[PDB]
Amino acid sequence: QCLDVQSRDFVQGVSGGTWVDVVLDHDNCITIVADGKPSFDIRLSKMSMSKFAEYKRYCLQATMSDVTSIVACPGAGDAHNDKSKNHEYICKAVNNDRGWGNGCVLFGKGSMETCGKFECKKKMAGKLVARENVESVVTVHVHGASATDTKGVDTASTAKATITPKASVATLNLNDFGSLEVDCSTDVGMDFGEIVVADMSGKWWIVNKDWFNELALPWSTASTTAEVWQARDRLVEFGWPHAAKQNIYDIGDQEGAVTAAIAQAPMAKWESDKVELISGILKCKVKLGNLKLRGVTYSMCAQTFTTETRPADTGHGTVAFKVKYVGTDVPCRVPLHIIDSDGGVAAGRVITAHPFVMKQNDYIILEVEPPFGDSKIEIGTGTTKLVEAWHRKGSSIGNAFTATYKGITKLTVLGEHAWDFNSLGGFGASLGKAVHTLFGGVFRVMFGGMGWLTKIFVGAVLVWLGLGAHDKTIATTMILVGSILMYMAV
Amino acid sequence: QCLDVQSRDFVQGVSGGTWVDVVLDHDNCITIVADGKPSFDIRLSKMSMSKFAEYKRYCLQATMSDVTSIVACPGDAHNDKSKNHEYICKAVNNDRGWGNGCVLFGKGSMETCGKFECKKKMAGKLVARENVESVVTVHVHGASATDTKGVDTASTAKATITPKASVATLNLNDFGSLEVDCSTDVGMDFGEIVVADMSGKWWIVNKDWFNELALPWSTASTTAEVWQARDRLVEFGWPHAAKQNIYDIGDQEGAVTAAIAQAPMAKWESDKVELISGILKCKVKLGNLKLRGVTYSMCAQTFTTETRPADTGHGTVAFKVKYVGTDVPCRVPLHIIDSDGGVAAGRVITAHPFVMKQNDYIILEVEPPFGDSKIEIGTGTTKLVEAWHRKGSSIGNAFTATYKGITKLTVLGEHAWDFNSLGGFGASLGKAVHTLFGGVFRVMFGGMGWLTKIFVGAVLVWLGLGAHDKTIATTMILVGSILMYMAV
Amino acid sequence: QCLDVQSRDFVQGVSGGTWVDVVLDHDNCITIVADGKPSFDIRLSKMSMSKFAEYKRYCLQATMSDVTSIVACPGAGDAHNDKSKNHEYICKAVNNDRGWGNGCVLFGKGSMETCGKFECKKKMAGKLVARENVESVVTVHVHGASATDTKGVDTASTAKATITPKASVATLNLNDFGSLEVDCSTDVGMDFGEIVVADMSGKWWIVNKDWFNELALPWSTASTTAEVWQARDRLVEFGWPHAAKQNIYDIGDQEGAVTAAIAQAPMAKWESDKVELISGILKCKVKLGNLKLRGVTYSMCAQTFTTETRPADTGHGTVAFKVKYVGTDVPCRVPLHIIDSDGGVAAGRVITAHPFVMKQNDYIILEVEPPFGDSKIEIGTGTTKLVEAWHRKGSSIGNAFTATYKGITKLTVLGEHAWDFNSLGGFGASLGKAVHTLFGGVFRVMFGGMGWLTKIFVGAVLVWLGLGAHDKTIATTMILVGSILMYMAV
Amino acid sequence: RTVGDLTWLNVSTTDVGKWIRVKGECFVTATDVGTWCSDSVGYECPQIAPAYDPEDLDCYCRNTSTYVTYGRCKNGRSGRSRSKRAITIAPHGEAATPQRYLMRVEKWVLRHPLPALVLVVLGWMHGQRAMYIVLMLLVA
Amino acid sequence: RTVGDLTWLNVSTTDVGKWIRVKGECFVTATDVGTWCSDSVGYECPQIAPLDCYCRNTSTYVTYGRCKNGSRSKRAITIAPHGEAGLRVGSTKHWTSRATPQRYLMRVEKWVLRHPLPALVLVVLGWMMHGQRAMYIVLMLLVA
Amino acid sequence: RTVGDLTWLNVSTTDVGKWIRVKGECFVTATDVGTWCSDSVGYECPQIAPAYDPEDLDCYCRNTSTYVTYGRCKNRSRSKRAITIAPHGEAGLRVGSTKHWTSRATPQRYLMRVEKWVLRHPLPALVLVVLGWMMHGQRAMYIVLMLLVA
């Protein structure tokens, strides 16, 4: 299922380990393979935040009603209104010189208290989001399974798991494959201290805290049920005083100004009180021990196979081609053979280890990694068996060194989780993991067909050369020998 | 009553002397026993001030009444009230117009006078260094105290020592009389403080800050006020042609209280105010003090305890024993003994206790030695034995005592030196060295032997004169210290 | 008049060399004594700016009249007003939404042009002033006259002459005393082009032209008859536009605001439609040749003189006493001799030279310096000759050294104007006047009574000693002789 | 309707221009007079002596003030806002590599030319000098 | 009650606004009026040829009180914050608030910590030359 | 009085609140209206006679719109905003701030700077002059240069 995305990486899990280290970008996928187990596909399906608390409520569209101005010309004391009691009422005291055209006893500063009722609609609500209660859901798909559907993806193969920094570990009950035990740390990246979700009428955004507070409007930190609306005056204005009345007007809605201001800000998808991040990455270590093969007990197929699509290069050094199974022996593992031009049958590592067909007329997906140069990949047995000839361009050692670079990068990214130093045994296991990751290509390619004992003796000879009387710097060969030896128990 | 307090200090007044130099602070209680004399508790009760003068009043609120305005047509209006000093009045320029009634419209004289009335008057009272009084109290341990508490009220007395009369004598019934000299030392300077008085609440603010406060103020007699500069609470209305209204600004109670509250509050009672931080460098002469009931015999009958030995954390054990018996005068034995060797424990504090009346609860506060110990407070098989253990080493307590002595000495220094006479200087030097090395001597030299100690001092004196470094001559000075302790 | 003021510095004008340099500050009366002529009192009287060109006219107070607004239906095209081209009329094109209730078919944003008359009041008048049109008047005065009034000043000694930057040369005709003419290069010291005279409603200030332009108001650079008033909006605003009608208002008086922003500036001295400058030095050269002694023919007096007031010292270093003359030989010269402690009468120096009287009872004012120490000022002959002993504080050579210093500083101040270089003879005369103004006191004091021939011989001896074979410092003997041979020959 | 020593009448669009006898006749000229509703305005009506002219008073009233309560619901739709402000608000904006660190060290050397020259002179007596320059840029 | 060649009358809320003949018909229209009250105002009512009251022929004085509403701009006088008074008064005086043991040593240690590298440099330089190091330390504290 | 292809009427204080028929009946309700003065107000009076009432209209007509010419002889400074101004005394400083080296005035003012520097940092000055004499007028030249440095 991960042919679709680029950036997929094949992390060959070392045999006899309970750690597999991965990183799952929001747009990513990893296909890990171990010797004794089928092939995984893991991709961070979708991060999400939820259970976020209310913060503030900025008014946008103000409405003034029941404006009431009361006056009293000098000598009678300052004007007073009843309406100053209600916080829902704005009130304002100004002085205006009562002219003789108004005609009370004296001339002088005529104080004016003016009051009116405040109404807000189309309010904007700001809500906090915390580093906690963020859950990313991880999807695993396991190859080899054979789906009766046109798309060769057995729905019963895939399982999900939601993981939080509060509940860091989760196990996926891959039916009949064995529970996959995954534990992980979700570095969000986009800090939850500085960002605040901005609830508009129908849209949401991820806006800066300082920007959100520096916005100037009438807000209300009270409950959403009823809002106090402090700092009302910023969105209403007082008419120039007249001896009789002081008219109060507001500016009207600010939908456009707010929309324009927030437009050049990250747009945040909203779904059932769940907002999808895109920054966060997962630093997961995959405990795969409790997983086992399936179908290993069957026989090998002997009926005919039919092709559905021609082998299309995936660009990732792999070949994918959905082959159908018309036959009778219902449960059966598909044999599979990658043959070099010469007699070499160790041509290339197979990704979809142990493909098996669980019904009649299934559409199994296969994915293989042919060797460099010429190749011929069989798909069955008998005269009728299909054959597909392939030619993989590119140098061998070149792909080896590109793999070394990729391993260096992935190691660095996983750096803290890549290394465990609680115990010397665990630290040794981690160091071996790093060595194997950084030297997998170099080993599996630059050391091929040499022979198992021969490689062991090569490491021993290099160790002796390092221990021999020579330059202290040249002892690097002795150190490299140990890495070779460690890569023999692999 | 000195069990409860903190910061207890123990001073062993040398026998054959008459000087005990102490310092007293509100939260400090000194318990001293001089061998051959009973115990003390001297504790400053309340350094207060009273009978202080009057210095100002501030008119926190203003009121106006029977205001009058006299307007003159253009081409000066004066008012009869202008001569009345109780009236504030102003001369302002505006003339009634033709519509107002005068022949010519324009600007002309107006005099607006009114009755300036004051209430809620703030009260300032300057207070002097003199006229500070302090009731030093003395409580003496070792009585019968028929109450449940071990306080025989006849064993206490109180004396007041104004700096004018630095010497007062307390009459302790039958113990003798305790007389004390003491040069008081107030901490809160009297130069720059003045006792403000709101409606009923009191304060302590800088005389500077008191004067530079801007309000209508009268220095005059207490009964009647003149109110100089009474303008700072009164504003005049807009000078209308008919009249110019006058009215107050507004009462300043809230404003002044908000400006001061970040300042000491002084709870007032009975025309007297307490004064917390006051040190008191008394010296006590205890020569006129004599033991009591030193002609009785030790107690034959039993004792009963009511509570456990409750430590006070000063290396003291206090425990309220009782007594049941017919021998109604009876000195109480107290053999504080240690778990090792059966050698007597150490310093007893409540010294020569007894029981005047049948069935009296007395308090025997005694100091047990470092280690495991046992307090034994009765004759025969009627005793009330106890188990105690003095957690903590000995020499540590010795060093702590030396440091405490250094602190007390340097605190009392200005007073604790008599340079007037050679005899006085010698007495002061002796008291100084004794106070600065009593603990080290008691611990480091305990059971050495009186003659052994004197001979050790002599050996040190000879060694100091021995052929060695001139800077190494400090051993000779050490001998002089050693010898002086043979006075005690 | 010259005695009362301070710093009445004297310049001992040389007889025959008709150059006498002066520097008339605002408060520096100079009395110069010619050995052959009566003495002068020349003292700057004022330096006035008046009758200077127009620059700018700000409209501090503006009134508004006959507002008319032209309306149009929303979407009917923008309306226009006839007055829109009139200079005295201000117009604005405001888009006001004429409503459905406003009485047109289509409601929405609509046109509105309002116009009205913009008329001025309390115009400020800026005016630049140049080097020309600021002229100075110098008043001369001579002594020896007989004032037939209690105030001992004779109008026949006072005389004025206005000198303009353009008309540097002017003559004063002291009646029968002669003619005193003088050139002078007026040097204001307060760059006129930089400042602009500000004419307020009735007040006159001095402000910085950059300040005055950068003032923010409506202005006109046009003729004083009719201002143009561009940028007139700055005092007129348009009220809230109503679909039917628009209002227009001013922004109230500005006299007070401009004053309070300026009153931190000096107030000019308003006299005769003119301001009086404060501190502009005048460097003049006064030619005195056509000045003749008056009454050198009269017989010396014999009658009785009546002192009516004790000789009061002016403080500057000379003594002055009002003196009457009763007698009958009314066209007579008053005698006067100065006698010190010793026998010689040459120790004195008279200021008012050749003092004479016209009528009987002519209050004259005599002035004289007494030789340092004690001295006796007699004022007549015969029996009733008055005698006044005076004691002079301070030393002689001290006054001499201060004289040399003051001469040097005055020379520096006059440096440019008091130096000619075109003709060599003129240069020599300038050098001679300089050497007198720099060494006259030193020469008169340090060599006083040595003797004319003796002084010349001393100068020759110094010159010959300069010819000796010695160091460069000893060669200053030649310079000293060059003062003896050049000063002590005139 | 008079309440609390204050006299009010539910004036309407019909009431413009004609006096209402209430101790003294009283009338209003409010341009916004109309239908009484939630969007209403209520204020005073100063009783002005005849020896004057109505000045700036939307209602000019005789010898007894009387409060008015005309609603601005004229022509059904709400009265004009008379908006007179622009609330405009700050736009949000859209929001160690050795290249930027090289920028920092270059700005240090150009920022402190004399100390940089001192360090360069000291280090020469080469690569150690460059390392010292990087370290010094870090330190300051 | 006319006394002192001036006509006074205890006006009340009743007679406001009604002409009263007293050698002229006279009336008052003030609003701050009320009952006989300690807040009483004295002023003339000038005769006006055809203000709270204008009179016709003979000017009168009124002394109405206002106990009906028996008070604005109550602006508290700006008065000092007592907390900083001690600091300011101390700031005026000289060299009585600095005792070398109590203050100067505190300053020495606060600075020597605040400038540790200069401290080490000075200590090393002084040691390159006993108590001279301590004297140099005190001096370096002084210079800063 | 209709003039210039537009109908005008000399409205007055008595005219407000009363109808006027001119080919329609028209009626003014403006409050600021008075008599002819030096300052008057002119504008159209559109006919809002159709069923719904006038809005934002001080006056309205019935069939033919008119123009009004009332004044403000009430026997009016809306929106007062004083024009703030530069303070004078600081102008002679501010303008002089921008120019360069015309306010240098080297004959004296630089020497005043030299003395101010010699006083302000006397320890470096003493060090500099001592070093200069250690190796005639060179000391004075060094002092002037250092004063220039700051």
PDB file of all heavy atoms in Angstrom, chain C residues 66-69 100 210 237 242-243 249, chain F residues 40 42-43 52 56 78-79 83 86 88 95:
ATOM      1  N   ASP C  66     -21.412  79.590   3.744  1.00  0.00           N
ATOM      2  CA  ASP C  66     -22.217  79.227   2.574  1.00  0.00           C
ATOM      3  C   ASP C  66     -21.825  77.862   2.009  1.00  0.00           C
ATOM      4  O   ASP C  66     -21.404  77.719   0.862  1.00  0.00           O
ATOM      5  CB  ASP C  66     -22.145  80.311   1.499  1.00  0.00           C
ATOM      6  CG  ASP C  66     -20.736  80.573   1.017  1.00  0.00           C
ATOM      7  OD1 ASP C  66     -20.005  81.326   1.692  1.00  0.00           O
ATOM      8  OD2 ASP C  66     -20.358  80.027  -0.039  1.00  0.00           O
ATOM      9  N   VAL C  67     -21.985  76.841   2.846  1.00  0.00           N
ATOM     10  CA  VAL C  67     -21.738  75.483   2.390  1.00  0.00           C
ATOM     11  C   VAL C  67     -22.887  75.027   1.501  1.00  0.00           C
ATOM     12  O   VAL C  67     -24.069  75.211   1.824  1.00  0.00           O
ATOM     13  CB  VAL C  67     -21.528  74.539   3.585  1.00  0.00           C
ATOM     14  CG1 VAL C  67     -20.354  75.014   4.411  1.00  0.00           C
ATOM     15  CG2 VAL C  67     -22.772  74.477   4.452  1.00  0.00           C
ATOM     16  N   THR C  68     -22.539  74.469   0.345  1.00  0.00           N
ATOM     17  CA  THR C  68     -23.513  73.900  -0.574  1.00  0.00           C
ATOM     18  C   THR C  68     -23.015  72.539  -1.023  1.00  0.00           C
ATOM     19  O   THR C  68     -21.836  72.386  -1.358  1.00  0.00           O
ATOM     20  CB  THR C  68     -23.741  74.799  -1.790  1.00  0.00           C
ATOM     21  OG1 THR C  68     -22.496  75.011  -2.465  1.00  0.00           O
ATOM     22  CG2 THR C  68     -24.319  76.133  -1.364  1.00  0.00           C
ATOM     23  N   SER C  69     -23.907  71.557  -1.030  1.00  0.00           N
ATOM     24  CA  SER C  69     -23.564  70.197  -1.410  1.00  0.00           C
ATOM     25  C   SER C  69     -24.408  69.783  -2.604  1.00  0.00           C
ATOM     26  O   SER C  69     -25.595  70.115  -2.676  1.00  0.00           O
ATOM     27  CB  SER C  69     -23.775  69.232  -0.244  1.00  0.00           C
ATOM     28  OG  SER C  69     -25.053  69.404   0.335  1.00  0.00           O
ATOM     29  N   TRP C 100     -32.421  54.049   0.105  1.00  0.00           N
ATOM     30  CA  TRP C 100     -33.743  53.889  -0.485  1.00  0.00           C
ATOM     31  C   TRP C 100     -34.730  54.870   0.128  1.00  0.00           C
ATOM     32  O   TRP C 100     -35.519  55.495  -0.589  1.00  0.00           O
ATOM     33  CB  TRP C 100     -34.200  52.441  -0.304  1.00  0.00           C
ATOM     34  CG  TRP C 100     -35.594  52.143  -0.747  1.00  0.00           C
ATOM     35  CD1 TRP C 100     -36.630  51.747   0.043  1.00  0.00           C
ATOM     36  CD2 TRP C 100     -36.113  52.226  -2.079  1.00  0.00           C
ATOM     37  NE1 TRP C 100     -37.758  51.561  -0.714  1.00  0.00           N
ATOM     38  CE2 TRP C 100     -37.469  51.855  -2.020  1.00  0.00           C
ATOM     39  CE3 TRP C 100     -35.564  52.574  -3.314  1.00  0.00           C
ATOM     40  CZ2 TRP C 100     -38.283  51.825  -3.146  1.00  0.00           C
ATOM     41  CZ3 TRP C 100     -36.375  52.544  -4.430  1.00  0.00           C
ATOM     42  CH2 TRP C 100     -37.717  52.172  -4.340  1.00  0.00           C
ATOM     43  N   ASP C 210      13.313  77.934   8.854  1.00  0.00           N
ATOM     44  CA  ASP C 210      12.985  76.522   8.740  1.00  0.00           C
ATOM     45  C   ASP C 210      11.851  76.139   9.675  1.00  0.00           C
ATOM     46  O   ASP C 210      10.985  75.344   9.299  1.00  0.00           O
ATOM     47  CB  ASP C 210      14.221  75.700   9.045  1.00  0.00           C
ATOM     48  CG  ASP C 210      14.845  76.113  10.340  1.00  0.00           C
ATOM     49  OD1 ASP C 210      14.244  76.977  11.003  1.00  0.00           O
ATOM     50  OD2 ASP C 210      15.930  75.621  10.686  1.00  0.00           O
ATOM     51  N   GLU C 237     -12.597  70.696   8.325  1.00  0.00           N
ATOM     52  CA  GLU C 237     -12.938  69.292   8.231  1.00  0.00           C
ATOM     53  C   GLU C 237     -14.393  69.170   7.826  1.00  0.00           C
ATOM     54  O   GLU C 237     -15.197  70.077   8.056  1.00  0.00           O
ATOM     55  CB  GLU C 237     -12.719  68.568   9.548  1.00  0.00           C
ATOM     56  CG  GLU C 237     -13.490  69.181  10.696  1.00  0.00           C
ATOM     57  CD  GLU C 237     -14.922  68.689  10.772  1.00  0.00           C
ATOM     58  OE1 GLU C 237     -15.218  67.626  10.193  1.00  0.00           O
ATOM     59  OE2 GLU C 237     -15.752  69.372  11.406  1.00  0.00           O
ATOM     60  N   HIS C 242     -24.144  63.214   5.401  1.00  0.00           N
ATOM     61  CA  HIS C 242     -25.516  62.747   5.314  1.00  0.00           C
ATOM     62  C   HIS C 242     -25.932  62.782   3.853  1.00  0.00           C
ATOM     63  O   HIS C 242     -25.551  63.697   3.118  1.00  0.00           O
ATOM     64  CB  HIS C 242     -26.454  63.619   6.143  1.00  0.00           C
ATOM     65  CG  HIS C 242     -26.080  63.697   7.585  1.00  0.00           C
ATOM     66  ND1 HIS C 242     -26.312  62.669   8.470  1.00  0.00           N
ATOM     67  CD2 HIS C 242     -25.482  64.681   8.296  1.00  0.00           C
ATOM     68  CE1 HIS C 242     -25.878  63.018   9.667  1.00  0.00           C
ATOM     69  NE2 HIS C 242     -25.369  64.233   9.588  1.00  0.00           N
ATOM     70  N   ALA C 243     -26.688  61.771   3.427  1.00  0.00           N
ATOM     71  CA  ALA C 243     -27.075  61.654   2.027  1.00  0.00           C
ATOM     72  C   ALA C 243     -27.700  62.951   1.534  1.00  0.00           C
ATOM     73  O   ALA C 243     -27.396  63.418   0.432  1.00  0.00           O
ATOM     74  CB  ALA C 243     -28.047  60.490   1.832  1.00  0.00           C
ATOM     75  N   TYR C 249     -17.007  72.446   9.036  1.00  0.00           N
ATOM     76  CA  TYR C 249     -16.656  73.198  10.228  1.00  0.00           C
ATOM     77  C   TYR C 249     -15.178  73.542  10.211  1.00  0.00           C
ATOM     78  O   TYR C 249     -14.373  72.873   9.559  1.00  0.00           O
ATOM     79  CB  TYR C 249     -16.969  72.414  11.496  1.00  0.00           C
ATOM     80  CG  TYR C 249     -18.378  71.896  11.557  1.00  0.00           C
ATOM     81  CD1 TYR C 249     -18.644  70.545  11.423  1.00  0.00           C
ATOM     82  CD2 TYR C 249     -19.444  72.755  11.759  1.00  0.00           C
ATOM     83  CE1 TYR C 249     -19.931  70.063  11.482  1.00  0.00           C
ATOM     84  CE2 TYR C 249     -20.735  72.281  11.819  1.00  0.00           C
ATOM     85  CZ  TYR C 249     -20.973  70.934  11.678  1.00  0.00           C
ATOM     86  OH  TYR C 249     -22.261  70.455  11.740  1.00  0.00           O
TER      87      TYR C 249
ATOM     88  N   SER F  40     -24.261  80.057   5.591  1.00  0.00           N
ATOM     89  CA  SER F  40     -25.526  79.378   5.362  1.00  0.00           C
ATOM     90  C   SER F  40     -25.261  77.983   4.816  1.00  0.00           C
ATOM     91  O   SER F  40     -24.124  77.610   4.518  1.00  0.00           O
ATOM     92  CB  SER F  40     -26.421  80.169   4.404  1.00  0.00           C
ATOM     93  OG  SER F  40     -27.655  79.502   4.208  1.00  0.00           O
ATOM     94  N   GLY F  42     -26.638  75.068   1.951  1.00  0.00           N
ATOM     95  CA  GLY F  42     -27.419  74.803   0.751  1.00  0.00           C
ATOM     96  C   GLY F  42     -27.296  73.354   0.324  1.00  0.00           C
ATOM     97  O   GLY F  42     -26.199  72.795   0.316  1.00  0.00           O
ATOM     98  N   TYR F  43     -28.428  72.753  -0.029  1.00  0.00           N
ATOM     99  CA  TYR F  43     -28.448  71.393  -0.556  1.00  0.00           C
ATOM    100  C   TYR F  43     -29.850  71.099  -1.071  1.00  0.00           C
ATOM    101  O   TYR F  43     -30.799  71.841  -0.797  1.00  0.00           O
ATOM    102  CB  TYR F  43     -28.021  70.378   0.505  1.00  0.00           C
ATOM    103  CG  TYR F  43     -28.687  70.570   1.841  1.00  0.00           C
ATOM    104  CD1 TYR F  43     -29.856  69.895   2.149  1.00  0.00           C
ATOM    105  CD2 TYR F  43     -28.138  71.402   2.804  1.00  0.00           C
ATOM    106  CE1 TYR F  43     -30.464  70.050   3.367  1.00  0.00           C
ATOM    107  CE2 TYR F  43     -28.743  71.567   4.027  1.00  0.00           C
ATOM    108  CZ  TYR F  43     -29.905  70.886   4.303  1.00  0.00           C
ATOM    109  OH  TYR F  43     -30.519  71.032   5.520  1.00  0.00           O
ATOM    110  N   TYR F  52     -42.811  54.765   2.075  1.00  0.00           N
ATOM    111  CA  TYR F  52     -41.952  54.655   3.245  1.00  0.00           C
ATOM    112  C   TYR F  52     -41.433  56.023   3.678  1.00  0.00           C
ATOM    113  O   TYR F  52     -41.261  56.938   2.868  1.00  0.00           O
ATOM    114  CB  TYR F  52     -40.792  53.712   2.945  1.00  0.00           C
ATOM    115  CG  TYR F  52     -40.100  54.022   1.645  1.00  0.00           C
ATOM    116  CD1 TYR F  52     -39.018  54.887   1.602  1.00  0.00           C
ATOM    117  CD2 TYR F  52     -40.522  53.441   0.458  1.00  0.00           C
ATOM    118  CE1 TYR F  52     -38.383  55.171   0.415  1.00  0.00           C
ATOM    119  CE2 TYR F  52     -39.900  53.726  -0.735  1.00  0.00           C
ATOM    120  CZ  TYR F  52     -38.825  54.587  -0.751  1.00  0.00           C
ATOM    121  OH  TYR F  52     -38.191  54.871  -1.938  1.00  0.00           O
ATOM    122  N   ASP F  56     -32.358  59.509   6.981  1.00  0.00           N
ATOM    123  CA  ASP F  56     -31.189  60.381   6.840  1.00  0.00           C
ATOM    124  C   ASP F  56     -31.536  61.632   6.041  1.00  0.00           C
ATOM    125  O   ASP F  56     -30.791  62.058   5.158  1.00  0.00           O
ATOM    126  CB  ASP F  56     -30.009  59.645   6.202  1.00  0.00           C
ATOM    127  CG  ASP F  56     -28.701  60.411   6.338  1.00  0.00           C
ATOM    128  OD1 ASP F  56     -28.610  61.275   7.233  1.00  0.00           O
ATOM    129  OD2 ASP F  56     -27.775  60.163   5.541  1.00  0.00           O
ATOM    130  N   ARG F  78     -17.692  71.904  15.899  1.00  0.00           N
ATOM    131  CA  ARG F  78     -17.691  70.451  15.916  1.00  0.00           C
ATOM    132  C   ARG F  78     -16.303  69.918  15.596  1.00  0.00           C
ATOM    133  O   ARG F  78     -15.587  70.473  14.757  1.00  0.00           O
ATOM    134  CB  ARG F  78     -18.709  69.894  14.920  1.00  0.00           C
ATOM    135  CG  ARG F  78     -19.159  68.476  15.230  1.00  0.00           C
ATOM    136  CD  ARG F  78     -20.592  68.190  14.809  1.00  0.00           C
ATOM    137  NE  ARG F  78     -21.567  68.761  15.733  1.00  0.00           N
ATOM    138  CZ  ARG F  78     -22.405  69.747  15.436  1.00  0.00           C
ATOM    139  NH1 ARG F  78     -22.407  70.283  14.225  1.00  0.00           N
ATOM    140  NH2 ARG F  78     -23.253  70.190  16.353  1.00  0.00           N
ATOM    141  N   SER F  79     -15.930  68.836  16.281  1.00  0.00           N
ATOM    142  CA  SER F  79     -14.679  68.120  16.028  1.00  0.00           C
ATOM    143  C   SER F  79     -13.467  69.034  16.196  1.00  0.00           C
ATOM    144  O   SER F  79     -12.683  69.244  15.271  1.00  0.00           O
ATOM    145  CB  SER F  79     -14.689  67.476  14.642  1.00  0.00           C
ATOM    146  OG  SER F  79     -14.528  68.460  13.643  1.00  0.00           O
ATOM    147  N   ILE F  83      -4.182  72.154  16.070  1.00  0.00           N
ATOM    148  CA  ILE F  83      -3.010  71.783  15.294  1.00  0.00           C
ATOM    149  C   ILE F  83      -1.776  71.859  16.168  1.00  0.00           C
ATOM    150  O   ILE F  83      -1.259  72.946  16.448  1.00  0.00           O
ATOM    151  CB  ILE F  83      -2.861  72.687  14.066  1.00  0.00           C
ATOM    152  CG1 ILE F  83      -4.092  72.580  13.182  1.00  0.00           C
ATOM    153  CG2 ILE F  83      -1.630  72.300  13.289  1.00  0.00           C
ATOM    154  CD1 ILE F  83      -4.324  71.188  12.657  1.00  0.00           C
ATOM    155  N   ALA F  86       5.525  72.285  16.240  1.00  0.00           N
ATOM    156  CA  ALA F  86       6.860  72.095  16.761  1.00  0.00           C
ATOM    157  C   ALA F  86       7.136  73.099  17.876  1.00  0.00           C
ATOM    158  O   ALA F  86       6.747  74.263  17.785  1.00  0.00           O
ATOM    159  CB  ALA F  86       7.891  72.261  15.653  1.00  0.00           C
ATOM    160  N   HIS F  88       9.376  75.711  19.860  1.00  0.00           N
ATOM    161  CA  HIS F  88      10.335  76.602  19.222  1.00  0.00           C
ATOM    162  C   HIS F  88      11.763  76.318  19.651  1.00  0.00           C
ATOM    163  O   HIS F  88      12.614  76.027  18.808  1.00  0.00           O
ATOM    164  CB  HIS F  88      10.010  78.057  19.515  1.00  0.00           C
ATOM    165  CG  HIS F  88      10.938  79.008  18.836  1.00  0.00           C
ATOM    166  ND1 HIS F  88      12.243  79.185  19.234  1.00  0.00           N
ATOM    167  CD2 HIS F  88      10.759  79.816  17.767  1.00  0.00           C
ATOM    168  CE1 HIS F  88      12.827  80.066  18.446  1.00  0.00           C
ATOM    169  NE2 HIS F  88      11.947  80.467  17.548  1.00  0.00           N
ATOM    170  N   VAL F  95      17.391  71.530  13.758  1.00  0.00           N
ATOM    171  CA  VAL F  95      17.901  71.792  12.419  1.00  0.00           C
ATOM    172  C   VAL F  95      19.417  71.679  12.404  1.00  0.00           C
ATOM    173  O   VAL F  95      19.997  71.088  11.489  1.00  0.00           O
ATOM    174  CB  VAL F  95      17.425  73.153  11.885  1.00  0.00           C
ATOM    175  CG1 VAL F  95      17.949  74.291  12.728  1.00  0.00           C
ATOM    176  CG2 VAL F  95      17.895  73.316  10.459  1.00  0.00           C
TER     177      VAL F  95
END
